[PDB]
């Protein structure tokens, strides 16, 4: 009868809470009034479209302003000594010298420097003028409108799909593997061959003439002939200059390895062959599940067949087909887990093997990106583990999964939790113990007494990969190894050359300071997983509260009685888990930032010597590289690092409000409000105004979220200001 | 008791007032300074907010030995009168100038004190009963809550008021001593040369302490120098305690941010592990009470904070 | 309002009625238990959900449960 | 005087007319004194009145 | 047996407090308490303040039923008295509440059939997949 | 200065002004 339209219960709430929950309840379909599986799936589908339309519009927006407000064309001509423009600024709040200050580049007013690496992205892909950016902006905007269209389209009763269709998993897998993965990477490879490669060779190929231009001299003869080697006949020379004819070859598909020496990025020929190769594996593999032809696998049959003899895995995977196909949260958990891993995967491979020409020369961009994807990966992981327990509560069928791997999982969960506890306490005690030991020796002027363990195991791996520093002589280090002799005339010359250039990021040199920090990160991993896993497995029931599953995923507590039950819900478990996310990726991003900062600065001996103790982090990382940042203004004058320092403090202030909502809880605030609501009602003149919605204190769960949110935002923004301002 | 509502509501008002018109001034300064508008700032140069009363009272204090206290030869203190007295080339005492920056910090104080009073007085006046919990008196002085009912009743007790009162007190007192230390090194202390004075921090206060960035940089960042490099010296213990106090401060946050529901289940799993190996204790392992969680929290928070400021000042001022 | 239920494990020791601040529960005759009496929740529209009732129950596991549900002016402890 | 200010404040009386007048004519008040661009009144439409400064990586 | 009549009787001595009534009593439901105090002895105002009781019938005015059952339990335990109490509506109607059936809820009285009484152990509840596709909860089965 | 003189103060005020107005009426009514 009032908004929340989707909840009678919340709509009848007389207070301001109705509002808050209404905002908070909006996307939870299963909890709305008179909901069905059909409406659930259909709303989810439409929502996916909605997301896509926002994404395409967002991307088009970037291209739009780079083309309209940027210096894209000044960059292409001189990428090394021009700062890429993101956007113009029109701020009526700025003072006279502010407008002078922010006018960087070739700009006719105040501008901001892009640290997204979209320049080098574009530029490496083939984008040459503002025109190209405009056309792409129009296109993707058109795709946005199309997606919006499509959302409302399959909302009508004629175009409403049936639940059976949504449950056709085999078909979606076949199509996504073959088409979405296979075809689209094949088509990209098409783009690299037809546009990117020629663009790097200095021949501008556009919509109007591609069809008329030969990418290879004897094109499409090798292809059908099976003389594929001709496509790798003459690669670009070692003196090739990117985007110019000088030193350019004709090959379209190679396995060279290493980098394009002047740009220091992967070879677009290697990238072409890569996308093409995977494309084939995807296309062949995408014909694996049974649909409407009779040929193909059964998922159910595969899963149910995989039960080992002598019941060492119980009933194996029997019943998982149904509990997965039914459970949406399960699918989102698997998806988020995989997506989180690959997000960090991307982050860790991109920095050490950059793919873009004249990236990695851009320090700030690289730092910004690598922080970006690791934090995104962290949040995504916590979320994976957050729809973990939502499954465990709402979705699991105890009878239908009897004695399976899943039920057996629940069975020995105390073992799992307790052994994670062991693994985290071990690390926590020893690593901290060895650091603080290292500090005390530093303090007393005896650094020779430090406990510095050399990372022999990683140093071994680097040796097996062909770095020769450590002199183990294994695999790709040793010249008398089959592994060496096999591919020595393939790509190893490009590889080995790149691994041993220590001015690049590829498999950096490692010492005892590396050793400690990785075990700090391991502490990060294991503990966060302890919170999340514990929260997932005890979502259903515990000894304190056996009937927890009757309440659901978020609840304040179960009262003060029998000891006290604050932060008992799996919700709260995930909440607690976010703090470790934050702390852990905080450590990882620092690790990253410094070990590069000292590389770029030209003194890696700063890192190796101060990373072995924590004051070293405090003094040589934090205290040193904020010098310029905090100076952005002083009583004497100003410079260009105004916004970062403003935002630095902004983040800190957000960070401390969070503490407010986290530490102080409801009873104080409500009674505060209780006196205020009397105060209003017997204040004359003001008497004549009264509220419609009774003023009430935010909930516990509300307080829980609002703290967390402020904390995270402050975290991110503060670092971002630091990272960028210092690296720049 | 019969009009507590008016008292607490008015204290609430006056505190929001004070908060806006003190913090708000610093945020305003930071924004104007960031936007390139120094002529619009709250400062002796641009904006003037002179402590006219204080200056009057200082005026009356130095002239007093002549008029209102004839038998008194010099002033009670040189921070009112003139006559800069110095010993061993160091400044013992000298007239303290009062400007806009001092106007600022005092009103911050007065804000902080008023907030602390808000929390504690509210605590004492409604200890027995309120609109939410009329029978609070029966429940005790020290107790966590009365459940998730009534929308949720977290931290209703008088203890919880003392709890939160400790944080604001720490806040207030911390700005006072920072005020003190910066004030003293910039406008008072230093060496005495050819008929002239070189202060320790060169009178940056009046111009720097008007913005948050000035504290961040000219006080915190610049001064922490001697503590952060105290290694290899006599003062290294202060660096160790510097780090240790951060540790313990941060360590408090685990207790403050969490609740014993998690911890008790954790303990269930660990207890399993013990029982599996016949090493379970007779004294059944239990998570701390909610109240104890709060007490441990506030205790470690204070100890960490205070000990960090302690290692800071002493290494700073000794070196 | 909040939901309050009494299960059959009730002993009828009456602590949960005697503890309530808003008189939601009452004692009724029954045939199941040694005390010849069981607890009941006929007035849950006045239930606040403060969970004194639960804290008062001696049975293992508790034989009163309060499920915090849709919230109304009374359940939110309002006097304004 | 009561006759001066009944007749004067009787056409703007209605509540529906305010969301039509105050919103659209109020935007017409921002879009007038908002678009009207020189040093005379604000220091941004003034623009940069000096030659560009040198960056950190030898940029324009 | 019959519920209480709702007459006019004088409230006990009180200088007045800020904790008392507000807009809720005017446009929502306020609450009234009735009892026969023997002597004049002091009591704790549950909305703050000292107040002297009078002999004979005394009535008070509150805007929440907790403020009754905090007082009633303070009148019942300390002074050993026995108060009745009921609601009010702003059109002039009354709702008789306590004791609902003359007998107080803790000791058993015939004619009070059991409500929200589940007749199984709590662990004999079904899993919440078996209550989707509805508007139902986990206990009512 | 042509476009951003119009679109900045409309996105700054006139979008949130009628958004806070029409979303308020959606909440209370
Ligand atoms: C955009 C800017 C933000 C604008 C609006 C949001 C701000 C206000 C949010 C606070 C409100 C939270 C809240 O309502 O508080 C309570 C809510 C809802 O709780 C629910 O409360 C419900 C209330 O019940 C009532 O309502 C029900 C129907 O709704 C029924 O009627 C029911 O019978 C009735 O009792 C039930 O009790 C449910 O059991 C219970 O789950 O808690 C929750 O679930 C929270 C809602 C789910 C959130 C999803 C997880 C978010 C995790 C984020 C992690 C950080 C991410 C940061 C990234 C930063 C990157 C840069
Ligand atoms: C969806 C992505 C996106 C994003 C994040 C932004 C963000 C921005 N745009 Mg917008 N803009 C976008 C797409 C986007 N734009 C698109 C696709 C177009 C149409 C081609 C425009 C056309 C546009 C104009 C005409 C203006 C802005 C302006 C702005 C700025 C002020 C906000 C505003 O006017 O609204 C801001 C940086 C204003 C600005 O630069 O100041 C401005 O005047 N934008
Ligand atoms: C070759 C055919 C094809 C292609 C190109 C796609 C492409 C896509 N599908 Mg899929 N889909 C396909 C066949 C295909 N689908 C079939 C046959 C079915 C039914 C069996 C589905 C059912 C399906 C669902 C249910 C959803 C997608 C979604 C998506 C999008 C995933 C998000 C992303 O950008 O990555 C993507 C555009 C998701 C989306 O974003 O919408 C989504 O929700 N698809
Ligand atoms: C979906 C992507 C795509 C598309 C639409 C095209 C389209 C085309 N390609 Mg192809 N091409 C692609 C991917 C793509 N290519 C990829 C991934 C590779 C790498 C193996 C090549 C390598 C390639 C070569 C080497 C040649 C073509 C050629 C052609 C043309 C003739 C094909 C024919 O008749 O058989 C045609 C316009 C021929 C041409 O004349 O151009 C030609 O010589 N293509
Ligand atoms: C594809 C991504 C995706 C999707 C579609 C959903 C969808 C949903 N999430 Mg979310 N969630 C996600 C990612 C996602 N989540 C991530 C990345 C995180 C970690 C930050 C979370 C953490 C999370 C929690 C902790 C909760 C939800 C909840 C919800 C539901 C209600 C949210 C609301 O109303 O506000 C809804 C079904 C809520 C629910 O009802 O369950 C809830 O409590 N989500
Ligand atoms: C600097 C602050 C700090 C410190 C020193 C610790 C220390 C610890 N925490 Mg953590 N923790 C913290 C903040 C901190 N926590 C915060 C702010 C929260 C959020 C409320 C948590 C939530 C948390 C959980 C949920 C768990 C730990 C656990 C642990 C232990 C991990 C094992 C180890 O390293 O030894 C250890 C005693 C784990 C444990 O006890 O095992 C565990 O499960 N902590
Ligand atoms: C920078 C962080 C921050 C900020 C911005 C605020 C802001 C505020 N707090 Mg504080 N508060 C903080 C941290 C912070 N708090 C922390 C960390 C805690 C936990 C101890 C508290 C605990 C707290 C209490 C208990 C009270 C305030 C109060 C207030 C308000 C004071 C009146 C005013 O200025 O308006 C104000 C909204 C007072 C209020 O309600 O007014 C009040 O009584 N705060
Ligand atoms: C986002 C929308 C927006 C818009 C359209 C404006 C527009 C304006 N502001 Mg600003 N201002 C904004 C946000 C905005 N402000 C915010 C959010 C704040 C609060 C922090 C302020 C606080 C503010 C002040 C205090 C003053 C201005 C002033 C001005 C004017 C400066 C240029 C002039 O002389 O004419 C102009 C009309 C100045 C003015 O009107 O004179 C002025 O003194 N603004
Ligand atoms: C990312 C990016 C972007 C975007 C993109 C996109 C989204 C795209 C799409 C799409 C595209 C751009 C596509 C194209 C296509 C093409 C084609 C497709 C063609 C073809 C032709 C032909 C002639 C062929 C034929 C044939 C044959 C011969 C045989 C077999 C069959 C067939 C039919 C195939 C931009 C730039 C904005 C920005 C930057 C980055
Ligand atoms: C970690 C944690 C716990 C669990 C932590 C506990 C129980 C702390 C106590 C642990 C110490 C180590 C036990 C003391 C043991 C004796 C001193 C004997 C040890 C034997 C010799 C080594 C001396 C809570 O109880 C808690 C409660 C409320 C909010 C947050 C938290 C919280 O964060
Ligand atoms: S959360 Fe607030 S209310 Fe629920 S138990 Fe812990 S303290 Fe008592
Ligand atoms: S407390 Fe548990 S046992 Fe005693 S009465 Fe209420 S329900 Fe029956
Ligand atoms: S919850 Fe508090 S109020 Fe609701 S019944 Fe149990 S005790 Fe009486």
- The label of the residue with tokens 């003359």 reads E102
The domain of A256 spans 1-728
Q: Tell me if B156 sits within 8 A of B135, measured CB to CB.
A: no
Q: Tell me if E127 sits within 8 A of E141, measured CB to CB.
A: no
Q: Tell me if A515 sits within 8 A of A459, measured CB to CB.
A: no
The neighbour count for residue B225, using CB atoms within 10 Å, is 14
Residue nearest atom 16 of ligand 3, based on CA coordinates? A172
Q: Degrees (nearest 5) of the Cα angle A599, A601, A603?
A: 65
Mutate to test the pocket of ligand 13, among C7, C10, C51 (most ligand atoms within 8 A of CB): C51
Q: Tell me if A539 sits within 8 A of A417, measured CB to CB.
A: no
- Cα separation, B76 vs B78, whole angstroms: 7
Q: Which long-range contacts (CB under 8 A, 24 or more apart) does A309-312 make?
A: none
- The label of the residue with tokens 């502010």 reads A98
- The label of the residue with tokens 């379970």 reads B280
Q: Tell me if A594 sits within 8 A of A370, measured CB to CB.
A: no
Taking CB atoms and an 8 Å cutoff, what residues of chain E touch B134? Answer: 46-47, 64, 66-67, 70-71
User: Could you say which DSSP state residue A686 is in?
Assistant: G
Per the document, the length of chain F is 29
Domain count along chain A? 1
* Residues C78, E24: C-beta atoms closer than 8 Å: yes
Taking CB atoms and an 8 Å cutoff, what residues of chain C touch B147? Answer: 49-52, 55
- Cα separation, A536 vs B111, whole angstroms: 45
* Residues C71, B135: C-beta atoms closer than 8 Å: no
The neighbour count for residue B65, using CB atoms within 10 Å, is 16
Among residues A576, A455, A461, which one has the least CA distance to residue A519?
A: A455
CA atoms within 13 A of residue B118's CA, in its CB half-sphere: 25
Pocket lining: A90 vs ligand 8, CB cutoff 6 Å: no
Residue of chain A with shortest Cα separation from D46: A96
- The label of the residue with tokens 């703007």 reads D12
Q: At what angle do helices A184-191 and A268-285 cross, to 10 degrees?
A: 160
Domain count along chain E? 1
Q: Which residues of B268-277 are buried (b: 16+ CB within 10 A; e: fewer)?
A: bbbbbbeeee
Q: Assess whether the previous peptide bond of D36 is cis (omega < 30° from 0).
A: no
Query: Please, which residues 1-29 of chain F have a Cβ atom closer than 8 Å to chain D?
Result: 1, 5-6, 9-10, 13-14, 17-18, 21
- Cα separation, A339 vs A387, whole angstroms: 14
Which element (helix H / strand E) includes E96? strand E96-98
A692 → closest Cβ in F1, F8, F28: F28
Q: Tell me if E30 sits within 8 A of E88, measured CB to CB.
A: yes
Residues whose CB is less than 8 angstroms from the CB of residue B26 and which lie 6 or more positions away in sequence, other chains included: B104, B210, B211, B212
Q: DSSP per residue over chain B, as a string?
A: -TTHHHHHHHHHHHHHHHHHHHHHHHHHHHHHHHTT-GGGSBSSSSB----HHHHHHHHHHHHTTTTT-TT--S-S-TTTS---EEETTEEEE------HHHHHHHHHHHHHHHHHHHHHHHHHHTSS--SS-TTGGGT-SS--BS-S-TT--BS-SHHHHHHHHHHHHHHHHHHHHHHHHHHIIIII-EEE-SSSEEESSTT-HHHHTTSHHHIIIIIIIHHTHHHHT-TTSSSHHHHHHHHHHHHHHHHHHHHHH--HHHHHHHHHHHHHHHHHTT---SS---PPPHHHHHHHHHHHHHHHHHHHHHHHHHHHHH-
Give the largest CA-CA distance in chain D. 74
Q: Assess whether the previous peptide bond of C61 is cis (omega < 30° from 0).
A: yes
Q: At what angle do helices A570-601 and B260-276 cross, to 10 degrees?
A: 90
SS (HEC) of B88-126: CCEEEECCCCCCHHHHHHHHHHHHHHHHHHHHHHHHHHC
- The label of the residue with tokens 């302690």 reads B310
The neighbour count for residue E135, using CB atoms within 10 Å, is 10
- Cα separation, A331 vs A343, whole angstroms: 18
Q: Is position A557 annotated in a ligand binding site? A: yes
User: In chain C, what are the domain boundaries?
Assistant: 1-80
Residue of chain A with shortest Cα separation from E126: A550
**Residue spans of alpha helices (H) in A262-404:** 268-285, 299-305, 320-326, 328-352, 363-390
Among residues A213, A62, A219, which one has the least CA distance to residue A144?
A: A62
Q: At what angle do helices A130-153 and A37-69 cross, to 10 degrees?
A: 160
Resolution (A): 3.4
Residues whose CB is less than 8 angstroms from the CB of residue A519 and which lie 6 or more positions away in sequence, other chains included: A427, A430, A431
- Cα separation, B132 vs C77, whole angstroms: 6
Residues whose CB is less than 8 angstroms from the CB of residue A37 and which lie 6 or more positions away in sequence, other chains included: A163, E133
User: Could you say which DSSP state residue E124 is in?
Assistant: G
Pocket lining: A567 vs ligand 11, CB cutoff 6 Å: no
Mutate to test the pocket of ligand 13, among C14, C19, C20, C67 (most ligand atoms within 8 A of CB): C20
Query: Please, which residues 3-62 of chain B have a Cβ atom closer than 8 Å to chain E?
Result: 3-6
Among residues A576, A660, A708, which one has the least CA distance to residue B164?
A: A660
* Residues A623, B36: C-beta atoms closer than 8 Å: no
Q: Tell me if E106 sits within 8 A of E99, measured CB to CB.
A: no
Q: Degrees (nearest 5) of the Cα angle A277, A283, A287?
A: 150
- Cα separation, A411 vs A55, whole angstroms: 43
- Cα separation, A540 vs A553, whole angstroms: 9
- Cα separation, B79 vs B94, whole angstroms: 5
Q: Which residues of E56-72 are buried (b: 16+ CB within 10 A; e: fewer)?
A: eebbbebbbbbbbbbbb
Taking CB atoms and an 8 Å cutoff, what residues of chain C touch B139? Answer: none
Taking only Cα atoms into account, the Rg of chain C, rounded to an integer number of angstroms, comes to 13
Residue nearest atom 14 of ligand 8, based on CA coordinates? F12
Q: Tell me if E67 sits within 8 A of E33, measured CB to CB.
A: no
Q: What is the CA E99 to chain-centroid distance, rounded?
A: 8
**Backbone phi and psi for residue B197, each to the nearest 5 degrees, phi listed first:** -130, 130
* Residues D44, A99: C-beta atoms closer than 8 Å: yes
E133 → closest Cβ in A37, A397, A546: A37
Report the C-alpha dihedral over residues B295, B296, B298, B304, rounded to 10 degrees.
160
- Cα separation, E73 vs B102, whole angstroms: 56
Q: Tell me if B153 sits within 8 A of B302, measured CB to CB.
A: no
Among residues A631, A645, A424, which one has the least CA distance to residue A525?
A: A424
Report the C-alpha dihedral over residues B158, B164, B168, B173, rounded to 10 degrees.
80
E135 → closest Cβ in A33, A547, A549: A33
- Cα separation, B190 vs B226, whole angstroms: 17
The domain of E79 spans 1-141
CATH code where residue E63 lies? 3.30.1470.10
Q: DSSP per residue over A454-504, as a string?
A: --HHHHHHHHHTT--SS----TTS-SSSHHHHHHTTTTHHHHHHHHT-TTS
- The label of the residue with tokens 């299963």 reads A30
Touch between A and B (at least 3 CB pairs under 8 Å):
yes
Q: Assess whether the previous peptide bond of A575 is cis (omega < 30° from 0).
A: no
SS (HEC) of A29-89: CCCCCCCCHHHHHHHHHHHHHHHHHHHHHHHHHHHHHHHHHCCHHHHHHCCCCCCCEEEEC
- The label of the residue with tokens 């770029």 reads A600
Q: Which residues of A388-417 are buried (b: 16+ CB within 10 A; e: fewer)?
A: bbbbbbbbbeeebbeebbbbbebeebbebb
Q: Which atom of ligand 6 lies closest to the CA of A576?
A: 19
- Cα separation, B280 vs B285, whole angstroms: 9
Experimental method: X-ray
Q: Tell me if C30 sits within 8 A of E111, measured CB to CB.
A: no
Write the CA distances from A463 to A203, A456, A508, A673, C27, integer angstroms.
Answer: 41, 10, 12, 66, 79
How far is the centre of ligand 6, averaged over its atoms, from the C-alpha of A345 (Å)? 27
Q: In Å, how far is C34's CA from the nearest CA of chain B?
A: 31
- Cα separation, A592 vs B49, whole angstroms: 47
Q: DSSP per residue over B258-297, as a string?
A: --HHHHHHHHHHHHHHHHHTT---SS---PPPHHHHHHHH
Touch between D and C (at least 3 CB pairs under 8 Å):
no
Four-residue CA torsion sign, A40, A44, A50, A54 = positive
Q: Tell me if C30 sits within 8 A of C36, measured CB to CB.
A: yes
Q: Tell me if A523 sits within 8 A of A580, measured CB to CB.
A: no
Q: Is position C10 annotated in a ligand binding site? A: yes
SS (HEC) of F1-29: CCCHHHHHHHHHHHHHHHHHHHHHHHHHC
CATH code where residue A141 lies? 1.20.1130.10
Four-residue CA torsion sign, A160, A164, A169, A175 = negative
- Cα separation, A562 vs A541, whole angstroms: 16
Q: Which structure tokens are listed for E14?
A: 């009180």
Taking CB atoms and an 8 Å cutoff, what residues of chain D touch A83? Answer: 55, 57, 59
Pocket lining: B259 vs ligand 10, CB cutoff 6 Å: yes
How far is the centre of ligand 2, averaged over its atoms, from the C-alpha of A21 (Å)? 32
A638 three-state secondary structure: strand
Residue A216 backbone class (left: φ over 0; alpha: ψ -120 to 50; beta: rest): beta
Taking CB atoms and an 8 Å cutoff, what residues of chain A touch B167? Answer: 663
Pocket lining: A213 vs ligand 4, CB cutoff 6 Å: no
Q: At what angle do helices B260-276 and A512-537 cross, to 10 degrees?
A: 100
């Amino acid at each position: 009868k009032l908004f929340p339209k989707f909840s009678q219960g919340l709509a009848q709430d007389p207070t301001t809470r109705r509002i808050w929950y209404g905002l908070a309840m909006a996307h939870d379909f299963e909890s709305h009034d008179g909901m069905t599986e059909e409406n659930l799936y259909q709303k989810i589908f439409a929502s996916h479209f909605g997301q896509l339309s926002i994404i395409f519009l967002w991307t088009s927006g970037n291209l739009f302003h780079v083309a309209w407000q940027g210096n894209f064309e000044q960059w292409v001509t001189d990428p090394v000594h021009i700062r890429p423009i993101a956007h113009a600024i029109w701020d009526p709040h700025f003072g006279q010298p502010a407008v002078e200050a922010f006018t960087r580049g070739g700009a006719s007013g105040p501008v901001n420097i892009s640290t997204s690496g979209v320049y080098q992205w574009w530029y490496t892909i083939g984008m040459r003028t503002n025109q190209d950016l405009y056309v792409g902006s129009v296109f993707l905007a058109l795709v946005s409108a199309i997606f919006l269209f499509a959302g409302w389209l399959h909302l009508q009763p004629n175009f409403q799909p049936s639940l059976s269709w949504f449950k056709d998993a085999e078909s979606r897998l076949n199509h996504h593997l073959s088409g979405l993965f296979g075809v689209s990477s094949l088509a990209w490879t098409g783009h690299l061959v037809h546009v990117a490669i020629p663009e790097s060779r200095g021949q501008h190929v556009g919509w109007d003439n591609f069809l008329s231009v030969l990418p290879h001299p004897q094109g499409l003869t090798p292809f059908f002939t099976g003389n594929w080697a001709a496509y790798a006949q003459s690669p670009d020379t070692a003196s090739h200059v990117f985007g110019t004819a000088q030193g350019s070859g004709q090959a379209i598909l190679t396995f060279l390895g290493g980098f394009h020496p002047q740009t220091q990025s992967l070879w677009l020929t290697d990238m072409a062959h890569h996308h093409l190769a995977i494309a084939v594996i995807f296309i062949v593999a995408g014909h694996m599940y049974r649909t409407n032809f009779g040929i193909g696998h059964r998922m159910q049959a595969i899963l149910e067949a995989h039960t080992p003899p002598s019941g060492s895995l119980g009933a194996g995977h029997k019943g998982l087909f149904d509990t997965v196909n039914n459970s949406l949260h399960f699918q989102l958990g698997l998806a988020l887990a995989s997506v989180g891993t690959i997000t960090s995967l991307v982050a860790q491979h991109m920095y050490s093997l950059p793919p873009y020409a004249f990236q990695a020369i851009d320090f700030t961009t690289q730092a910004a990106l690598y922080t970006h994807h690791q934090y995104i990966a962290g949040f995504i992981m916590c979320g994976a583990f957050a729809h973990g327990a939502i499954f465990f509560i709402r979705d699991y069928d105890p009878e239908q999964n009897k004695g399976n791997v899943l039920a057996r999982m629940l069975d020995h969960k105390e073992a799992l939790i307790s052994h994670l506890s062991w693994v985290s306490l071990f690390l926590g005690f020893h690593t901290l113990g060895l650091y603080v030991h290292n500090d005390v020796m530093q303090a007393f002027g005896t650094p020779e007494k430090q406990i510095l363990i050399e990372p022999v195991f990683a140093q071994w791996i680097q040796a097996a990969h062909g770095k020769a520093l450590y002199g183990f002589d294994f695999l790709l280090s040793s010249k008398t190894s089959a592994a060496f002799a096999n591919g020595q005339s393939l790509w190893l010359p490009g590889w080995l050359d790149a691994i041993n250039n220590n001015q690049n990021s590829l498999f950096l040199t490692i010492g005892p300071g590396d050793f400690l920090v990785h075990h700090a990160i391991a502490l990060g991993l294991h503990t966060t997983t302890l919170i999340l896993v514990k929260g997932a497995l005890d979502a259903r029931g515990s000894k304190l509260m056996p009937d927890k599953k009757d309440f659901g995923y978020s609840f304040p507590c179960d009262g003060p009685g029998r000891g006290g039950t604050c932060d008992i819900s799996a919700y709260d478990a995930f909440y607690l888990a976010v703090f470790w996310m934050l702390n852990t990726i905080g450590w990882v991003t620092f690790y990253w930032h410094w070990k590069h900062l000292t590389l770029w600065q030209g003194n890696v001996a700063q890192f190796d010597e101060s990373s072995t103790y924590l004051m070293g982090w405090l003094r040589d990382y934090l205290w040193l590289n904020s010098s310029q940042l905090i100076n952005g203004y002083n009583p004497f004058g100003m410079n260009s690092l105004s916004v970062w320092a403003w935002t630095f403090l902004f983040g800190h202030l957000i960070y401390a409000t969070g503490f407010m909502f986290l530490i102080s809880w409801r009873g104080y605030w409500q009674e505060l409000i209780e006196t205020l609501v009397w105060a209003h009602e017997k204040t004359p003149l003001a008497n004549l105004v009264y509220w419609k919605d009774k003023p009430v204190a935010l909930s516990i769960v509300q307080a829980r979220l609002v703290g967390l949110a402020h904390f995270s935002v402050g975290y991110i923004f503060t670092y971002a200001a630091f990272l960028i301002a210092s690296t720049s | 008791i019969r009009h507590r509502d008016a008292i607490i509501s008015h204290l609430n008002w006056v505190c929001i007032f004070l908060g806006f018109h003190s913090f708000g001034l610093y945020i305003h300064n930071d924004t104007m300074s960031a936007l390139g508008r120094p002529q619009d700032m709250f400062s002796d140069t641009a904006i003037q907010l002179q402590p006219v009363f204080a200056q009057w009272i200082q005026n009356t204090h130095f002239l007093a030995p002549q008029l209102t206290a004839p038998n008194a030869l010099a002033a009670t203190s040189l921070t009112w009168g003139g006559d800069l007295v110095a010993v061993g080339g160091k400044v013992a005492m000298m007239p303290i100038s009062l400007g806009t920056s001092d106007f600022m910090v005092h009103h911050i104080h007065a804000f902080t004190i008023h907030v602390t009073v808000l929390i504690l007085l509210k605590g004492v006046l409604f200890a027995r009963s309120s609109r939410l919990i009329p029978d609070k008196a029966n429940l005790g002085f020290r107790f966590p809550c009365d459940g998730p009912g009534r929308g949720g009743t977290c931290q209703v007790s008088a203890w919880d008021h003392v709890f939160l009162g400790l944080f604001w007190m720490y806040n207030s007192l911390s700005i006072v001593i920072f005020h003190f230390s910066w004030k003293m090194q910039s406008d008072v202390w230093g060496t005495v040369t050819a008929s002239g004075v070189s202060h320790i921090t060169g009178g940056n206060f009046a111009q720097s302490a008007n913005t948050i960035n000035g504290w961040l940089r000219d006080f915190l960042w610049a001064q922490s120098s001697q503590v952060i490099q105290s290694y290899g010296s006599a003062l290294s213990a202060y660096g160790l305690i510097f780090l240790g106090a951060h540790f313990v401060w941060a360590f408090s946050l685990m207790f403050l941010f969490s609740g014993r529901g998690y911890w008790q289940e954790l303990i269930e799993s660990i207890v399993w592990a013990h029982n599996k190996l016949k090493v379970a204790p007779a004294i059944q392992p239990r998570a701390l009470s909610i109240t104890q969680g709060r007490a441990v929290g506030v205790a470690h928070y204070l100890l960490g904070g205070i000990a960090t400021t302690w290692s800071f000042f002493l290494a700073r001022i000794i070196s | 309002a909040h939901i309050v239920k009494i299960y059959d494990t009730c002993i009828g020791c009456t602590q949960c009625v005697r503890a309530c601040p808003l008189d939601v529960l009452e004692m009724v005759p029954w045939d199941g238990c040694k005390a010849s009496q069981m607890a009941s929740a006929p007035r849950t529209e006045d239930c606040v959900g403060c969970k004194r009732c639960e804290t008062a129950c001696p049975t293992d596991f508790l034989s009163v449960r309060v499920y915090l549900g849709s919230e109304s002016t009374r359940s939110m402890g309002l006097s304004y | 005087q009561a006759k001066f200010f009944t007749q004067a404040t009787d056409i703007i009386s209605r509540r529906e007319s305010l969301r039509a007048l105050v919103a659209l004519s109020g935007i017409a008040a921002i879009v007038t004194y908002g678009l009207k661009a020189k040093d005379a009144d604000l220091p941004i439409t003034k623009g940069p009145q000096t030659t560009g400064e040198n960056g950190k990586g030898g940029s324009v | 047996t019959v519920p209480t009549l709702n007459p006019d009787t004088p409230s006990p001595i009180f200088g007045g407090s800020t904790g008392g009534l507000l807009r809720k009593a005017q446009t929502e439901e306020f609450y009234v308490i009735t009892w026969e105090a023997k002597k004049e002895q002091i009591f704790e105002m549950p909305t703050g303040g000292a107040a002297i009781m009078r002999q004979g019938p005394n009535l008070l005015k509150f805007g929440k039923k907790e403020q009754c059952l905090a007082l009633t339990t303070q009148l019942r335990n300390k002074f050993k008295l026995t108060p009745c109490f009921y609601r009010v509506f702003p059109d002039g109607k009354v709702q008789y509440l306590h004791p609902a059936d003359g007998v107080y809820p803790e000791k058993v009285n015939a004619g009070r059939v059991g409500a929200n009484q589940n007749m199984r152990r709590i662990g004999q509840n079904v899993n919440p997949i078996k209550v989707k596709f509805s508007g139902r909860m986990m206990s009512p089965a | 200065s042509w476009a951003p003189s119009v679109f900045v103060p409309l996105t700054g005020l006139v979008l949130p002004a009628i958004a806070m107005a029409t979303l308020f009426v959606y909440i209370e009514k």
